[PDB]
Amino acid sequence: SGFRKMAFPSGKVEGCMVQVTCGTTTLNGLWLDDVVYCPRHVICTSEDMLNPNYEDLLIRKSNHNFLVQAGNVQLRVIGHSMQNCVLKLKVDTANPKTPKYKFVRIQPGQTFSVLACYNGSPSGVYQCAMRPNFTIKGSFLNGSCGSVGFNIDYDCVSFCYMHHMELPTGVHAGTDLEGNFYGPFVDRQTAQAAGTDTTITVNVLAWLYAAVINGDRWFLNRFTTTLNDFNLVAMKYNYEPLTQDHVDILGPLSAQTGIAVLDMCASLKELLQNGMNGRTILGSALLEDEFTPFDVVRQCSGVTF
Amino acid sequence: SGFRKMAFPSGKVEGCMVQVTCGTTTLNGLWLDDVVYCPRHVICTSEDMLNPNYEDLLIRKSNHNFLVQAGNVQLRVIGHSMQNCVLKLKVDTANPKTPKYKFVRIQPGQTFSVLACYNGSPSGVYQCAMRPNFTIKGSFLNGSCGSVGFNIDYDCVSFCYMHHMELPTGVHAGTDLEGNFYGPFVDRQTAQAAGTDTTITVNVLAWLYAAVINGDRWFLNRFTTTLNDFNLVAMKYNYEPLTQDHVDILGPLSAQTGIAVLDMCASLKELLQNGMNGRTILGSALLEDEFTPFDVVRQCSGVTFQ
Ligand SMILES: *[C@@H](CC(=O)OCC)[C@H](C[C@@H]1CCNC1=O)NC(=O)[C@H](CC(C)C)NC(=O)[C@@H](NC(=O)OCc1ccccc1)[C@@H](C)OC(C)(C)C
Ligand SMILES: *[C@@H](CC(=O)OCC)[C@H](C[C@@H]1CCNC1=O)NC(=O)[C@H](CC(C)C)NC(=O)[C@@H](NC(=O)OCc1ccccc1)[C@@H](C)OC(C)(C)C
């Protein structure tokens, strides 16, 4: 038993991180097959990050203006191009450690593991969720751009995030590995802000199922609710609306526990209206919303990779 | 900016996980050079769970009673010995993925990453503190024993924990890699309970410093405290006493923020008296105590957001 915020094992992604240098700017790159992917703002000096013209900046660059370091082995760049906000560097050597992988674009509410890297060297791993406002509450300092987020669907690494920037409230924004931003952001240093966020209701409910599975049942009640009357209370507390597809996804957890989805909704409604009353759930004083239903199942059944 | 519970990258440890089987029992083992380390209760049967005599169980085994699988390759066991609560299986092949490593015994309050493993394969990685009562708040199921805890310093892996058991409140207990349990626990299924646990005060202070580094000062106040008066109040909230050594290890964080340690102690006293009143600190509505001063320095910026 026990329930922790748990990242995927990172070994397969560790073997893909490299250091990419253009001029005085150095950040991280992802080395897969014979291409290195990194944020396109690597071709910026500090003096053109306000309104960079990326087409023009790259037009003046040649393959030899890019230094890619994998360990203490340099990888010759033999071609370069942009795809959206990602720079793609073709190198002379296919990564022998390339895992089975795909690029996926995730939706708000979905979680992923982040391998935070500096100078091409992995420094730590943690879980994030893509917020409904398309930011993530990460932990990133200068030099972390190019760090990647990922999930493992047994043996296949699904890359879903590359890190680009930090916003004033200290939350983080980036792209998929095809260079498309999550959220209404741009890769320059003009004023931008995260929108108002909401709580991921289906994840809260999955976390309550995780709570039941771990022996905490004090928040369960014998009341019932319809889907509509719960959504009426939820939005009052700034919760994402609960859909039938959300109810359906919670099916396996409802089956394992014997607590119907609407009955867990009635418990969440009471938790929202009355609070925890000095009690805690799974060590938290807040209702946690960064576990997906599959996150709960993977952890509580000991799924491996 | 930001502040997260952060594990060490698990690849160097993933390369050492193997599966150990003795009879009907399978668990995880740690393969370093030509030795595999696993919990000794792999040799127990259903009749040996309350009062096993491990010496008498182990003398009845040959090398070939132990099957060690690394991937889909069986390693041949060529020697075995018992050291406290761990078994050491000598194998005929050195692990080519062995990192630089050390075995260390950690002190209460220190943290480490756990690689949860089943059948020799990794499931996930998470961060844990050794509680003052010598338990950890992990996530472990049947089959997880032999999973190891570790810290990584400049590509040297310091192994500090091997998992052995769960207690009835849901917390976990285990040994160092020399097989000596943390705390008063034994590898028997006789009734056992963790002692009354306490909050790791120096870690809570480190975390408040993290909050200030990341730009939040709302919880500070104009007061200070003596060390003795702080310890008298904080013990009433089941907080571990703060020592001068703890005050000293907080020196770097104090100097980066301009907040004397005893002044942060005054802030903690008031937070305990008042609670949060609907606010959070670094995203949490309770006082977090599983980040060491070292963890904060590792993860936070070297420049305070003033
Ligand atoms: C990664 C780049 C890198 O690693 O290069 C190393 C040489 C960083 C990651 C940031 C730095 C601090 N924490 C992070 O996660 N990326 C950047 O610095 C971004 C470069 C741009 C060219 C994309 N810049 C920012 O993240 C910037 N945010 C920003 O400008 O957003 C717009 C804005 C909003 C309000 C006011 C002005 C601008 C950061 C650095 O600026 C702050 C003030 C928002 C933190
Ligand atoms: C690893 C080996 C394994 O799976 O073997 C299965 C037969 C597990 C890890 C546990 C399983 C559940 N979560 C974990 O972390 N270790 C064990 O199963 C232990 C084997 C013993 C030979 C050491 N047993 C326990 O962990 C046991 N705890 C226990 O007996 O504590 C003593 C006790 C205290 C009060 C009352 C009775 C016993 C667990 C499995 O038993 C429960 C009922 C306490 C959970």
Q: Is the separation of the CB atoms in B91 and B76 below 8 Å? A: yes
Q: Using CB atoms and an 8 Å cut-off, which of residues 263-282 of chain B contact chain A?
A: 280
Measure the CA dihedral A36/A38/A43/A47, to 10°: -160
DSSP string, B133-193: TS-B-----TT-TT-EEEEEETTEEEEEEEEEEE-TTS-EEEE-TTSPBSSS--SS-S---
- H/E stretch holding B77: strand B77-83
Contact B122 A6 (CB under 8 A): no
Tokens, residue A173: 């924004």
Q: Whose CA is nearest to atom 30 of ligand 2?
A: B189
Residue A187: how many CB atoms within 10 A of its CB? 22
For the sheet containing A73-75, what is the strand order?
Answer: A73-75, A67-70, A17-22, A25-32, A35-39, A86-91, A77-83
CA of A71 to the centre of ligand 2 (A): 43
CATH superfamily of A11-91: Trypsin-like serine proteases (2.40.10.10)
The dotted CATH code for A201-301 is 1.10.1840.10
Q: Using DSSP, state whether A183 is helix, strand or coil.
A: coil
Contact B125/A at CB under 8 A:
yes
Torsions phi, psi of B6, nearest 5?
Answer: -125, 125
Strands (E), chain A: 17-22, 25-32, 35-39, 67-70, 73-75, 77-83, 86-91, 101-103, 111-118, 121-129, 148-152, 157-166, 172-175
Burial track B251-279 (b if 16+ CB lie within 10 A, e otherwise): eebbebbebebbbbbbbbbebbeeeeeee
Please report, for residues A129, A163, A274, A276, B262, the alpha-carbon distance to residue A134 in angstroms, rounded to integers and kept in the order given: 9, 13, 30, 29, 40
Contact B126 A4 (CB under 8 A): yes
**Any ligand 2 atom below 6 A from CB of B168:** yes
B36 Cβ contact list (under 8 Å, min separation 6): B18, B20, B29, B30, B68, B75, B77, B88, B89, B91
- Measured in angstroms, the CA of B250 and the nearest CA of chain A are apart by 22
Catalytic annotation present for B41: yes
Q: Whose CA is nearest to atom 20 of ligand 1?
A: A165
Q: Using DSSP, state whether A41 is helix, strand or coil.
A: helix
- Measured in angstroms, the CA of B55 and the nearest CA of chain A are apart by 30
Query: Residue A39: beta bridge partners?
Result: A86
In angstroms, what is the resolution? 1.8
A191 Cβ contact list (under 8 Å, min separation 6): none
Determine whether B168 is exposed, middle or buried from the number of CB atoms within 10 Å of its CB (0-12, 13-18, 19+).
exposed
Report the distance separating Cα A151 and Cα A133, nearest Å: 21
Identify the experimental approach: X-ray
Query: Residue A87: beta bridge partners?
Result: A38, A82
**Any ligand 2 atom below 6 A from CB of B113:** no
Topology of domain B201-299, per CATH? main proteinase (3clpro) structure, domain 3 (1.10.1840)
**Any ligand 1 atom below 6 A from CB of A165:** yes
Torsions phi, psi of A184, nearest 5?
Answer: -85, 55
Report the distance separating Cα B74 and Cα B230, nearest Å: 57
Contact B11 A7 (CB under 8 A): no
Contact A280 B299 (CB under 8 A): no
Same topology, domains A11-91 and A201-301? Answer is no
CA of A187 to the centre of ligand 1 (A): 9
Torsions phi, psi of A83, nearest 5?
Answer: -125, 105
Tokens, residue B21: 């089987």
Catalytic annotation present for A41: yes
Q: Using DSSP, state whether A137 is helix, strand or coil.
A: coil
CA of B123 to the centre of ligand 2 (A): 19
Instruction: Measure CB to CB from residue B123 to each of A166, A285, A302 and give the nearest one.
Output: A302
Q: Is the separation of the CB atoms in B166 and B140 below 8 Å? A: yes
Q: Whose CA is nearest to atom 13 of ligand 2?
A: B141
Q: Which atom of ligand 1 is nearest to the CA of A142?
A: 11
CA of A302 to the centre of ligand 2 (A): 16
